[PDB]
Curated annotation (Swiss-Prot):
Pfam families: Thaumatin (PF00314). This is Thaumatin I. InterPro entries: Osmotin/thaumatin-like_sf, Thaumatin, Thaumatin_CS. It comes from the Eukaryota.
Amino acid sequence: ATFEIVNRCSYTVWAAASKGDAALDAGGRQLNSGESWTINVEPGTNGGKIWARTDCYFDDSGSGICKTGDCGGLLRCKRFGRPPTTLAEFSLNQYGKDYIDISNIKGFNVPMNFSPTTRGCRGVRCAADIVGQCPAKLKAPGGGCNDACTVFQTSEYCCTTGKCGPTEYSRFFKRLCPDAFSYVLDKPTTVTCPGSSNYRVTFCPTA
Ligand code: NA
Ligand code: NA
Ligand code: NA
Ligand code: NA
Ligand code: NA
Ligand code: NA
């Protein structure tokens, strides 16, 4: 499957793509404002994620640091990124269909649209100014808006027992972005697409 990743932000981002225990395609790349990077994701990929990283520095070996979404200091991510990270999430070719969503469960750093480029389903978007409106206690000094699990490490925010409810913090994310997951047991906003669809992830879609 192809994913075109497009940076419409006025600032550089470092795109990242991983399924948690491996890179997808090259795993990461710099995208200056306006640049597009197309990756190939193997059919059947389960639990894939794409995200933006901000304020990165990398040496020639591709080692360094980002202020949001850092994946163990690598340009080319093999693992998931450090919150806060707006997440494009997908599982492909799962009994004949693809499943996509956007999640704020690991916080928010960059606004995002995640849409099919082929027929048969709609896209999802979280493009509100969540960083600007972020509750004081969730603001990440390094940048972005943390989720409450990251900040407070409670069973209720992290849904550790599989029994949690919405919270004042999850409701903030849900108010600003109704079409993204705001906590683990949120009413799902997953979209079913035809199996083997192709996609576009756009950072700052309303820029
Ligand atoms: Na992101
Ligand atoms: Na990184
Ligand atoms: Na998530
Ligand atoms: Na506030
Ligand atoms: Na939260
Ligand atoms: Na936007």
